[PDB]
RNA sequence: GUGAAGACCGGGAAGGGGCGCCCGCCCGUCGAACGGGGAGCCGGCGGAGACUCCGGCAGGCGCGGCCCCCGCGGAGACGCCCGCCCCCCGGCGACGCGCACGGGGACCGCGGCGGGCGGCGCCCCGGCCCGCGAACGCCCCGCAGCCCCCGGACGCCUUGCGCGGAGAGGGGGGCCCGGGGGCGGACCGCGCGUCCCCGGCCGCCCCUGAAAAGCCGGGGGGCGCCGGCCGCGCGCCGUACC
């Protein structure tokens, strides 16, 4: 049973194809399908520097993600929920709530492999 | 890189002891020159009464520019748009439209046209 | 007193390639430090027609190891190159068909394609449809080999050549008949203006040596001598032998 | 419709020799091969030497007149052999 | 009555881009007007397929939202191209990690 | 072919014939089995009784 | 030559912009064709009566040159 | 480099661009009034001129002013008020021929009605003529094709085919379509053909059917643009007639 929450997955489809997301919540498989909320890094960090980490909390389907081995412990379902992020309002909060949780794990060199860019080369 | 460059010297401005050209004087496109007769043919008179045009001969070495600025500057009216044609016979003939405020007929007449 | 068709060739006029729309000159990648001491990699992108070849060419892509983009190489496929195969080159490539590797490193017995004369050349031996060289006997006291060519000579060539395992492509392209004339206008007009053939017999005394006389006949041995002079060297040339057997 | 089945476009012309020698070649120039990749029979030539499959979308090198050649057979399996040894 | 229509080129030779398709005027008289070649849209580097999204129009005319697609790499490659390239780069790196990296520890 | 084809698929969207029935029909069709509409009719009111 | 989708637009071009001239035209006869022109485009709104046409010119006032035909 | 030269032959040469500082081996402001190319239509007006004048109506490309100022939506295919340079990686430009088959446009034809004629010894609602709608802006539709989602098959389809466990059918969607419809600009129906353009195929080759300017994506870096509005500008030559 590989989908779990707390499992970092690429995103292979879409606008966030080739970033990394962790799902908060796997969703019942319904007549849609198998979807699942994932909370995901948008836009690294910053550049090279001498900034903040743009983030994206979407109901992605299963099958447009490749499951990874990597980990990642966010609490999310406290606020993430089928019913949040599927509320247009409120979401934008959440996201702004994943932005800075995740950019605190950049500056205490936390989650390294998450916070890295898989190099798709053409 | 692996490439041996001519190494980047000084590259000097001119500078000639004695003055190439002294005096400096010539060329044709003195503004009275440029323009050189208007044409009077009754299919140009009606021109000048329904179109603001007139029409004139000018020096074939006359970019359109020049001879909408030496019109302006020597019959001292504005112009919109001139059309010029190098004729068969060899001369550049342009039609120079006057603008829309100054009145063709009163410039002719001024012109002794 | 008439320059022959033979003399006329040499200029150039009329009588050069067609090379008109040609992909472009087919070598083997260029041999680097790292070919020298390992192997590089290309995906294969392309197999595309050149207009005289009868073998079909590659478009190769080959990593920049001198800067940062990718170099595209025209290699003759060798049979069974298929869109997306990786392409290895050097003195670590393993035995696959296409990979390209220094001919003393192949084990012998291997057909091989685009064999080099002399290491570094890109390229010479084996290139046209179907044919192929075969690795025969490595001397590791000399260090050359000895390559089957295809016509079955036999030369010594240095181990530190390159050649790509596998046989050209486009094999049994003359079994086809050409049948018709047309067909055979089409073949070379892709090539040189060296079509239709007249014999000398049908021309006249200046036209040609064979020349005319009242009886279409050659009037003497076709035969000629290594050292016949440019307008006459015409017919067999040095013959060691004629005639079926 | 009998002994002549795609060389009838030539008629009464070339000769049997050409004729047969045609069939032969013609029949496997328009033949449908199987894909290596794909395993569909849907090779077919685009030009000599030029193979591409119509539903795996491979462009693959082979003979000019077959996907596969028998000289060609014979060296993959003697690669292989040699290969396995070093 | 008459329909000839003459030419509205500078020369009549009819190469691709002199093709005159004929319509009526507001004033009854039989008109050419130039049928352009329509450009193609851009294609897949990889595959060859036309990219979708892109209108056929030369991108010079097109401004910028219409001559581009929302996707990482959306105009160089179509999506399943560009979902077998995330897959190479994450599956190859980690078969070093599970085999070049386990053979460390193992 | 045509009006035979689109009165074969009117029948089997309607759901009066059989998938299987509309394939054999459909080759038959091809074979020139059948002349005209009233041809091919005929033969269905047969085939489905 | 598009045509102004509903008055309010064709208000907030006559304030904002150029109105030029407009022409409020009577012909479909009755219906009122009210060519805006603006530099960039002539834009027209037909009102389906008279009144609301006259009503819509008097929105406008001095702001642009008005013709009639 | 070579030849007594006139001259002929030619990469192995310390061969440029930014910016006051890095990058960079090395030519074509030659060659096509049929190839590529940023963008034009209608109505009028003269004895001779019109894609050129004039009136309208647009479009392209720059330049200045003035205001505004940085991503969202979708499950996905993608949709939307749109950023630039440098290096890479691409794309458009950019392409064979043929039988068919379909779809558009122009033409043609047949009716009706509305407006004009002509003939007529007999007949005649049976003859002749006219009834027009451009570029361009929007909004909607557009076969085939190509993709997405669900799901898991003896089916689905063409004139011919072809297609499907590498995902068919079915049900919902996206995209492209030299096109049509509506409204602007500003008489109604129906038909078989003709031409021209296009579409998806399928066939054919020991034949595989130009290139580059120009424009534009994308990755990575470095920077912040960009838009809206309003003005203005567009030089050089050809243009008669046969």
Redesign the interface.
């Known amino acids: 049973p590989i989908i779990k929450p707390g499992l970092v997955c ?1 995103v ?4 966030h ?3 990394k997301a962790v799902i908060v919540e796997a969703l019942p498989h319904n007549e849609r399908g198998s979807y699942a909320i994932v909370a995901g890094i948008a836009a690294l960090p910053r550049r090279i520097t001498n900034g903040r980490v743009r983030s994206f909390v979407k109901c992605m389907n299963v099958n447009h993600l ?1 499951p ?2 990597c980990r990642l412990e966010n609490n999310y379902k406290d606020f993430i929920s089928t019913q949040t992020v599927a509320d247009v309002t409120k979401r934008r909060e959440i996201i702004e709530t994943v932005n800075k949780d995740f950019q605190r794990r950049i500056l205490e060199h936390r989650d390294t492999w998450f916070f890295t860019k ?5 | 890189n692996v490439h041996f460059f001519r190494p980047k010297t000084l590259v000097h401005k001119k500078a000639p002891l004695y003055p190439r050209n002294p005096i400096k004087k010539g060329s044709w496109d003195d503004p009275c020159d440029l323009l050189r007769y208007p044409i009077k043919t009754d299919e140009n008179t009606t021109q000048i009464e329904k179109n603001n045009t007139i029409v004139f001969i000018v020096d074939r070495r006359a970019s359109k520019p020049e001879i909408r600025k030496a019109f302006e500057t020597v019959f001292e009216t504005k112009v919109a748009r001139v059309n010029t044609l190098i004729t068969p016979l060899g001369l550049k003939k342009a039609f120079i439209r006057l603008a829309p405020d100054v009145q063709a007929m009163d410039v002719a007449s001024k012109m002794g046209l | 007193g008439r320059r022959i068709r033979v003399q006329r060739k040499g200029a150039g006029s009329v009588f050069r390639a067609h090379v008109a729309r040609r992909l472009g000159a087919a070598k083997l990648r260029a041999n680097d430090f790292a070919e020298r001491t390992g192997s590089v990699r290309g995906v294969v992108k392309a197999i595309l027609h050149d207009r005289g070849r009868g073998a079909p060419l590659a478009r190769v892509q080959f990593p920049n190891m001198r800067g940062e983009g990718r170099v595209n190489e025209l290699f003759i496929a060798p049979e069974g190159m298929y869109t997306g195969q990786e392409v290895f080159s050097g003195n670590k490539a393993t035995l696959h068909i296409g990979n390209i590797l220094p001919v003393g490193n192949i084990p012998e017995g291997t057909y091989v394609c685009n064999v080099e004369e002399k290491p570094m050349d890109r390229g010479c031996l084996a290139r046209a449809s179907g044919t192929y060289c075969l690795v025969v006997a490595h001397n590791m006291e000399t260090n050359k080999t000895r390559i089957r060519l295809p016509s079955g000579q036999k030369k010594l060539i240095s181990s530190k050549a390159r050649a790509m395992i596998g046989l050209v492509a486009g094999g049994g392209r003359t079994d086809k008949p050409l049948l018709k004339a047309g067909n055979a206008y089409h073949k070379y007009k892709a090539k040189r203006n060296c079509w239709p053939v007249v014999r000398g017999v049908a021309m006249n005394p200046v036209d040609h040596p064979h020349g005319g006389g009242n009886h279409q006949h050659i009037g003497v041995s076709s035969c000629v001598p290594r050292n016949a002079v440019p307008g006459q060297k015409v017919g067999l040339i040095a013959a060691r032998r004629t005639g079926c057997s | 419709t009998k002994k002549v089945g795609l060389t009838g476009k030539y008629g009464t012309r070339y000769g049997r020799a050409a004729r047969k020698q045609l069939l032969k070649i013609e029949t496997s120039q328009k033949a449908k091969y199987t894909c290596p990749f794909c395993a569909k029979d849907k090779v077919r030539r685009t030009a000599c030497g030029i193979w591409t499959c119509r539903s795996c979308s491979k462009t693959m090198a082979g003979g000019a007149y077959s996907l596969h050649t028998e000289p060609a057979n014979a060296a993959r399996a003697t690669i292989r052999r040699l290969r396995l040894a070093r | 009555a008459d329909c000839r229509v003459t030419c509205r080129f500078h020369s009549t030779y009819r190469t691709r881009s002199k093709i005159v398709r004929y319509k009526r005027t507001p004033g009854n008289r039989l008109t050419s007007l130039r049928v352009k070649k329509l450009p193609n849209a851009p294609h897949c ?1 990889e595959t060859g397929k036309q990219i979708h999204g892109i209108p056929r129009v030369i991108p010079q005319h097109l401004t910028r939202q219409q001559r581009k697609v ?4 959306g105009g ?2 179509c ?1 399943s191209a ?2 077998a ?3 190479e ?2 599956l190859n ?2 078969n070093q990690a599970l085999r070049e990296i386990a053979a460390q520890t193992a | 072919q045509r009006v035979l084809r689109r009165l074969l698929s009117r029948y089997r969207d309607d759901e009066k014939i059989d998938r299987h029935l509309y394939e054999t029909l459909y080759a038959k069709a091809k074979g020139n089995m059948f002349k005209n509409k009233r041809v091919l009719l005929e033969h269905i009111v047969g085939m489905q009784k | 030559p598009n045509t102004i989708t509903e008055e309010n637009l064709m208000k907030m071009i006559a304030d904002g912009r150029g109105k030029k001239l407009v022409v409020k035209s009577c012909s479909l006869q009755g219906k009122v064709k009210l060519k805006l022109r603006t530099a960039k485009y002539l834009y027209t709104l037909t009102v389906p009566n008279a009144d609301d046409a006259k009503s819509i010119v008097k929105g406008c006032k001095d702001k642009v040159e008005v013709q009639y035909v």
């Open positions: 690429i292979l489809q879409g606008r194809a080739g970033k490749m990874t081995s898989l190099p798709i080369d053409a | 580097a929302s996707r990482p790499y160089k490659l999506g560009l979902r390239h995330i897959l780069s994450f790196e980690e």
